[PDB]
C-alpha cells in the first residue's frame, strides 16, 4: 500500500490528543440517571403503601 | 444505703427527702455532665449499607498525549 492502510475515524478534533467518545463522556449523568429509578424503585418496593 | 424514708425507733422519728434514682440528683448530674460539649447533643450518622465508588466511570480512561 505505501503506508499503513488504516484510516483513523475521530470522532471528536482536540489539539490536546484527547479521543473522547460520547459514552464514557456522559457516564455521570447516566449514572445519576439510574440512581434516581433505583431510588424510585426502592420507594415503591418498600413504602408504597400504608 | 438502704434509701429509706423514714426511721421511728421509739420517740424518735426521722422522715427524709425522695432518694435519687442512681447516685446523682438532676442537679449533680447536670454538674457532672458540663464537660460534654455542644450542650449535650449527640448526633449518630447514619448509612444505607452502600459501600460507594467514587472512582466509577473514571476506570475506563487512556492516556492520549505527551503524560505529564
Same mark, same amino acid.
Given at each position: 500500500?505505501?503506508?499503513?492502510?488504516?484510516?483513523?475515524?475521530? =470522532?471528536?478534533?482536540?489539539?490536546?490528543?484527547?479521543?473522547?467518545?460520547?459514552?464514557?463522556?456522559?457516564?455521570?449523568?447516566?449514572?445519576?440517571?439510574? $440512581?434516581?429509578?433505583?431510588?424510585?424503585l426502592?420507594?415503591?418496593?418498600? =413504602?408504597?403503601? $400504608? | 444505703?438502704?434509701?429509706?424514708?423514714?426511721?421511728?425507733?421509739?420517740?424518735? =422519728?426521722?422522715?427524709?427527702?425522695? &432518694? &435519687?434514682?442512681?447516685?446523682?440528683? &438532676?442537679?449533680e448530674?447536670?454538674?457532672?455532665?458540663?464537660? $460534654?460539649?455542644?450542650?449535650?447533643?449527640?448526633t449518630?450518622?447514619?448509612?444505607?449499607?452502600?459501600?460507594?465508588?467514587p472512582?466509577?466511570? $473514571?476506570?475506563?480512561?487512556?492516556?492520549?498525549?505527551?503524560?505529564?
Amino acid at each position: 500500500v505505501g503506508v499503513c492502510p488504516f484510516v483513523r475515524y475521530v =470522532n471528536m478534533m482536540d489539539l490536546d490528543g484527547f479521543t473522547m467518545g460520547e459514552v464514557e463522556y456522559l457516564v455521570p449523568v447516566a449514572s445519576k440517571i439510574d $440512581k434516581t429509578d433505583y431510588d424510585r424503585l426502592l420507594a415503591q418496593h418498600y =413504602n408504597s403503601w $400504608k | 444505703p438502704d434509701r429509706v424514708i423514714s426511721r421511728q425507733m421509739g420517740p424518735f =422519728n426521722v422522715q427524709y427527702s425522695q &432518694p &435519687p434514682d442512681g447516685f446523682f440528683y &438532676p442537679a449533680e448530674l447536670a454538674i457532672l455532665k458540663r464537660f $460534654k460539649r455542644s450542650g449535650g447533643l449527640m448526633t449518630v450518622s447514619t448509612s444505607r449499607g452502600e459501600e460507594g465508588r467514587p472512582w466509577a466511570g $473514571k476506570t475506563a480512561y487512556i492516556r492520549y498525549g505527551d503524560g505529564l
